[PDB]
Design a protein around this nucleic acid. Structure first.
Ligand code: MG
Lengths: 105, 678
DNA sequence: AGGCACTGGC
DNA sequence: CAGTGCCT
């Protein structure tokens, strides 16, 4: 249920999309990214119909991250109507993500 | 004989004030100090020693003290003072001859730590005095709550300076005696601190005299400087910088930027077992932050971190064509499989391998040539304008680059050049070589009287290495090789001795043989590698037994592991041998070096005996000596003709002087600059 | 082979 | 300091 983004599909899938979109900027060589990965799978299964979870691997798609000043990963950006509503960095626990989502959703 | 040293307010280039000087006289055994107001008396004391047919010892006096005294005498006293070359001894020059197996800080211009091997103690102390005096000056300053400035320790005379001056003469005196105690260079029967100048030069090993004449002339060469076309190079700089930008733009379009971990402090540990994972990039765990800001009775925390939630800090990096790492990274991701690495894991990324790299993507395959051009252009930009020793940073007010020269910096007797190294200017055959080379030339100097540009005479020793080789094999082949070089075609002959195809292959093989080169580059001429290479260098020797005999005779003399770790040079000096396999090469390079050294000395001497004056205010000026070639500025075309013919005469003289079994020659060319004169 | 020196990266 | 390249 997770949307795997690409540099060229980013604009339409995220910025022009309707509804809340949580984007995860990640890399295969990052330990913390591998930690939150499972958490995101469960979040996509739970928040269906209220929010969409999307992932962007920064090694395969290097043009997007720079535009948002990413300085650490995994980076989570919650987009609403083409703009960043909230942003958190780090392998949040499932519990901490729900609060983040529920609070910003 | 007297031993002396002075302290002045700056380097030769800008010195204007004599601070003090000290003199130790062997005939009285006393040290005499001369303060600022005793300058005339100091000079009178030096000339008195000259009048007696005596000797004056300075440490590095040939390049500094002596010309400095000439300059200060004129400025401060409006007096003409010129110590004659024959009356001067230089312990730095002597050390470099006798301890040729050791490095030195070049009087404080190089940091000790960087120099390999050990350093002679006395010479070390002499080269660190300025830095030591400086450290003490500051100490005293920042001890009286007084701010230190750049180099104010040399602005005014003071007793701390006078004491160091005295100590320099005691150390120089000790170095001298230590050097004179070397029986190989100075016969034991003679007390060299008690003889006249003619006896000093005549009773010591020929090398002593030669090194002192070389240092004297090369000191003059540095003072002359090499006329440089600053404008031409600034324009080349603009051109290169534009090609660099354009190549950067294209390469950044081809190889996009990426992210790399950076700034991680804490180790990453498996959340399950807690087992440390060292291969994983370093992470960082925030100790502050949450989803909600701290309550007080709850507003969302704007911050982006969460206590306990770890993340891997990263940096954004743009492809840099100058980075071997980026190139390796981007090319393998394109399908490149490194066939050769360095002894550190990193894969080799030099021009030769890049030449062999083959990737599927056509745009990336073409980008490799852009990377190769980029690296080459960076090499030129660095040497011409941006590097620490760039030409544009070294050109002086008189429009000349005064490169430094260590007359005997190499173990073999060759000179070393630096600040900047004028013996590494790109040749006309390499990219931009024409423009770099044309920028150095007599044409860029306008006569002080007529304003007319000067002319350049470029002269080199013809096939010097092969001739040196011919000479040493003469005792095994009776001059056969020497006879072939002079009349037949030594190259064709070598092409036959070594079963090689083209005549040029041999013409490239031999030089590879003399200048040392593994079977790799060797066989790299016959398509193969170090494979047929081993076969080639063997079939050659097989058909040229004189060379084999020579090599064997050298071995017998050195290895009995050693019976003697040095070989005798043409002028009798000891030439340290680093390894048994490099013995023949050390011998050949040393002969060429010593032949070229005596040659430029004899050339200048013959010119002066013919009435020509050495200097920009004269008829000619030595601008550069690059191993087996000299570039001389001449006031006129006729003078350049004379310099060329005289150089040829001097070379013959040198060959006859050392009873060389192979005739030596020179080829000269006249023109406006280095590009045309070579 | 003998040297000097530039740039990248720690 | 490692890896390279410029000169003879
Ligand atoms: Mg001194």
């Amino acid at each position: 249920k997770i949307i795997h983004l690409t540099d060229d599909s980013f604009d339409t899938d995220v910025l022009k999309a309707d509804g809340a979109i949580l984007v995860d900027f990640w890399a295969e060589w990052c330990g913390p990214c591998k930690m939150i990965a499972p958490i995101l799978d469960e979040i996509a299964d739970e928040y269906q119909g209220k929010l969409t979870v999307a992932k962007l691997n920064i090694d395969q798609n290097p043009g997007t991250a720079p535009k948002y000043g990413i300085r650490g990963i995994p980076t989570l950006l919650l987009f609403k109507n083409g703009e960043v509503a909230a942003t958190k960095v780090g392998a949040l626990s499932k519990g901490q993500l729900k609060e983040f989502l529920d609070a910003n959703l | 004989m007297i031993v002396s040293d002075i302290e002045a307010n700056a380097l030769l280039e800008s010195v204007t004030k004599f601070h003090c000087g000290v003199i130790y006289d062997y005939s009285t055994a006393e040290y005499v100090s001369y303060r600022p107001s005793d300058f005339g008396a100091y000079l009178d004391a030096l000339e008195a020693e000259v009048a007696r047919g005596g000797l004056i010892v300075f440490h590095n006096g040939h390049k500094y003290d002596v010309p400095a005294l000439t300059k200060l005498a004129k400025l401060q006293l409006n007096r003409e003072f010129h110590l004659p070359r024959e009356n001067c001894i230089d312990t730095l020059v002597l050390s470099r001859l006798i301890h040729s197996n050791l490095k030195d800080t070049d009087m404080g211009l190089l940091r000790s730590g960087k120099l390999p091997g050990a350093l002679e103690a006395w010479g070390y102390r002499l080269g660190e005095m300025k830095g030591e005096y400086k450290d003490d000056f500051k100490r005293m300053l920042e001890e009286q709550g007084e701010e230190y400035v750049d180099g104010m320790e040399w602005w005014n005379f003071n007793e701390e300076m006078m004491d160091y001056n005295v100590q320099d003469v005691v150390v120089t005196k000790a170095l001298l005696e230590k050097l004179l105690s070397d029986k190989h260079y100075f016969p034991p029967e003679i007390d060299f601190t008690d003889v006249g100048y003619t006896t000093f030069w005549s009773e010591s090993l020929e090398a002593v005299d030669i090194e002192h004449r070389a240092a004297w002339l090369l000191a003059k060469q540095e003072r002359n400087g090499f006329p440089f076309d600053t404008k031409a190079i600034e324009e080349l700089y603009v051109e290169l910088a534009a090609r660099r930008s354009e190549l950067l733009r294209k390469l950044t379009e081809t190889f996009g930027s990426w992210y790399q971990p950076k700034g991680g402090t804490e180790m990453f540990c498996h959340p399950r077992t807690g087992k440390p994972l060292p291969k994983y990039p370093r992470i960082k765990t925030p100790k502050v932050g949450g989803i909600f800001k701290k309550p007080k009775n709850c507003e969302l925390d704007t911050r982006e971190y969460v206590a306990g939630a770890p993340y891997t800090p990263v940096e954004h990096v743009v492809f840099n064509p100058s980075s071997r790492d980026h190139i390796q990274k981007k090319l393998q991701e394109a399908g490149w499989v490194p066939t050769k690495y360095t002894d550190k894991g990193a894969p080799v990324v030099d021009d030769e391998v890049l030449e062999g790299v083959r990737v599927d993507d056509p745009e990336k395959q073409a980008a490799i040539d852009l990377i190769k051009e980029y690296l080459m252009i960076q090499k030129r930009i660095g040497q011409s304008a941006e590097g620490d020793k760039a030409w544009l940073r070294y050109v002086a007010e008189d429009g000349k680059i005064h490169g430094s020269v260590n007359p005997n910096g190499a173990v073999t007797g060759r000179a070393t050049h630096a600040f900047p190294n004028l013996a590494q200017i790109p040749g006309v055959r390499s990219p931009y070589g024409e423009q770099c080379r044309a920028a150095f030339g007599a044409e860029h100097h306008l006569d002080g009287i007529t304003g007319k540009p000067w002319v350049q005479a470029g002269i080199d020793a013809s096939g010097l290495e092969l001739r040196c080789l011919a000479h040493f094999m003469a005792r095994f082949d009776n001059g056969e090789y020497a006879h072939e070089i002079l009349n037949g075609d030594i190259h064709t002959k070598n092409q036959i001795a070594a079963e090689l195809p083209t005549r040029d292959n041999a013409k490239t093989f031999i030089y590879g043989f003399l200048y040392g080169a593994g079977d790799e580059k060797i066989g790299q001429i016959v398509g193969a590698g170090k494979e047929r290479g081993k076969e080639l260098k063997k079939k050659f020797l097989e058909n040229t037994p004189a060379i084999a005999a020579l090599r064997e005779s050298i071995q017998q003399t050195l290895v009995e592991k050693w019976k003697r770790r040095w070989i005798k040079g043409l002028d009798g000096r000891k030439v340290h041998v680093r390894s048994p396999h490099a013995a023949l090469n050390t011998l050949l390079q040393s002969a060429g070096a010593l032949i070229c050294k005596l040659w430029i000395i004899k050339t200048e001497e013959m010119l002066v005996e013919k009435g020509l004056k050495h200097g920009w205010d004269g008829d000619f000026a030595y601008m550069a000596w690059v191993h087996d070639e000299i570039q001389v500025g001449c006031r006129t075309e006729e003078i350049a003709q004379v310099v060329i013919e005289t150089a040829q005469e001097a070379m013959r003289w040198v060959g006859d002087h050392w009873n060389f079994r192979c005739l030596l020659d020179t080829e000269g060319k006249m023109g406006p600059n280095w590009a045309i004169c070579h």
